Design a protein around this ligand. Structure first.
Ligand SMILES: Cc1sc2c(c1C)C(c1ccc(Cl)cc1)=N[C@@H](CC(=O)NCc1ccccn1)c1nnc(C)n1-2
Length: 127
């Protein structure tokens, strides 16, 4: 069993910049979700080897996790807020695609996603 390489967190060929919206995504959104009691499964890529999920990366072809997002934000990898919001949405959707309704991990994702929605509702206007 083998895990894929993780999503990239640096790439000099990718355009990037800082925006006040990306700063909010780090200081408000990511921080809020990261500290939540249910954050831990999402703080790093799914280790399909150790979790004994050999089909995970056969169903989930665009993996994402908050460890990756955190590094992307800290590294100023993004060009805009939409790219980062998309990464969060990918992470949640992957969990729902792979798992079953009512599963613990789905309940965890739903709790995080509720907080994500509450925070992105107040994304600031771009300066
Ligand atoms: C470090 C990680 S990452 C992650 C997980 C863990 C531990 C876990 C997880 C499960 C329960 C709770 Cl309380 C917390 C997390 N779920 C996997 C899916 C999975 O193991 N299915 C088979 C199965 C069999 C029996 C019982 C439950 N699931 C998963 N899917 N997306 C993410 C992210 N995970």
């Amino acid at each position: 069993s083998m895990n894929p390489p993780p999503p990239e967190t640096s790439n000099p060929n990718k355009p990037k910049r800082q925006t006040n919206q990306l700063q909010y995504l780090l200081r408000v959104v990511l921080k809020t979700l990261w500290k939540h009691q249910f954050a831990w499964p999402f703080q790093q890529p799914v280790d399909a080897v150790k979790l004994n999920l050999p089909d995970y990366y056969k169903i989930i072809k665009t993996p994402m996790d908050m460890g990756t997002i955190k590094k992307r934000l800290e590294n100023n990898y993004y060009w805009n807020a939409q790219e980062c919001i998309q990464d969060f949405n990918t992470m949640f959707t992957n969990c729902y695609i792979y798992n079953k309704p009512g599963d613990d991990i789905v309940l965890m994702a739903e709790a995080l996603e509720k907080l994500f929605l509450q925070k992105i509702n107040e994304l600031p206007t771009e300066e």
